[PDB]
Write a protein that binds this ligand. Structure first.
Ligand SMILES: O=S(=O)(O)CCS
Ligand SMILES: [Zn+2]
Length: 340
């Protein structure tokens, strides 16, 4: 059976810690790059709103790069926009970002709407998953990406209020977190229904760079656990920054895989504190290695990750849009060279 893996079965097995023939190489974070936008005719920002173009751009960084999955969409704003956040849609090389927060003072009116799945670009993402499945077939995995519940709550109330309430109005923090989690689960299961094989949430606001490890444990962990156990899929939890102080807690959250940056140090250092509770995904620096290169540095840092027991070889965060195609190929070549 070790000789019969598909790209899909290898990723799922790897994330679950089952035996595999080799470590898979892919990205669970955003994969839109300028060089590919130009090659296949699917540039931002149009690729965020047109499902066919969203599909094409995502496909390109599988077919033309060798990454062993397809990942969509390209931003952390689809769900929060659907929940009332105002968004700036960015540019050809700048991601959409949140500019307006609907609930900076109180949660009056914040309930999750019955028509959530019809709002904003949620229908675009769901359709793009179906289109991508058509284009790659059943044996290549589709990773559905989204902002996580902590980041959703914070986007809804503004990060200033979120941080303030964490100390001074913890009941409101919790209410915001519960609404955010409920909406996140509904969206994540919708993506599973549409064809996603893995749901990979990115929750930067849960990072120790922004929230204390103690507040992670006290308030955030239980919602991340509720998310993982309510979503009917293998899941991955991505949190950037130096997450070492919460890495064990991340490993308790019910996600099969933990996606981390280079800021944890070597993959081995991470493996040594999570044991068999969760698998590790990463961790080659997106801005400081994949973006500038050189190819040889990408490969060396990738090989260190593999030697340290990384379960899925991946960029540490979103691929920087100006990343050359050749640098993405380098990540794949490193895995291939590793197995001789
Ligand atoms: O993958 S993304 O670049 O969209 C976000 C990472 S925190
Ligand atoms: Zn990140």
């Amino acid at each position: 059976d070790m000789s019969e893996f598909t790209l899909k079965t290898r990723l799922l097995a790897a994330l679950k810690g089952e035996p595999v023939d080799k470590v898979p190489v892919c990205s669970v974070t955003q994969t839109g790059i300028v060089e590919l936008m130009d090659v296949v005719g699917a540039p931002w920002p149009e690729a965020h709103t047109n499902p066919e173009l969203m599909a094409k751009l995502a496909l390109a960084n599988h077919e033309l790069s060798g990454l062993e999955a397809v990942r969509l969409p390209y931003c952390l704003t689809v769900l929060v926009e659907a929940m009332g956040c105002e968004i700036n849609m960015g540019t050809k090389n700048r991601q959409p970002s949140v500019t307006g927060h609907p609930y900076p003072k109180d949660l009056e009116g914040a309930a999750v709407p019955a028509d959530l799945l019809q709002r904003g670009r949620i229908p675009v993402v769901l359709e793009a998953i179906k289109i991508i499945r058509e284009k790659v077939g059943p044996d290549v995995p589709i990773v559905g990406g989204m902002e996580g519940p902590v980041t959703v709550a914070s986007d809804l109330v503004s990060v200033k209020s979120f941080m303030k309430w964490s100390i001074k109005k913890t009941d409101l923090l919790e209410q915001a977190l519960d609404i955010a989690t409920e909406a996140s689960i509904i969206y994540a299961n919708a993506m599973v229904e549409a064809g996603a094989d893995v749901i990979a949430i990115a929750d930067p606001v849960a990072s120790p760079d922004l929230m204390s490890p103690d507040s992670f444990r006290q308030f955030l962990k239980s919602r991340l656990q509720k998310f993982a156990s309510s979503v009917n899929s293998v899941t991955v939890l991505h949190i950037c920054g130096n997450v070492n102080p919460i890495l064990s807690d991340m490993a308790d959250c019910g996600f099969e895989g933990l996606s981390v940056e280079e800021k944890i140090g070597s993959a081995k250092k991470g493996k040594e504190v999570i044991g068999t509770r969760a698998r590790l995904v990463g961790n080659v620096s997106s801005p400081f290695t994949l973006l500038p290169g050189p190819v040889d540095k990408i490969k060396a840092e990738a090989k260190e990750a593999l030697e340290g027991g990384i379960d899925v070889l991946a960029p540490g965060c979103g691929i920087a849009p100006m990343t050359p195609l050749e640098n993405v190929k380098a990540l794949v070549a490193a895995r291939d060279e590793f197995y001789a």
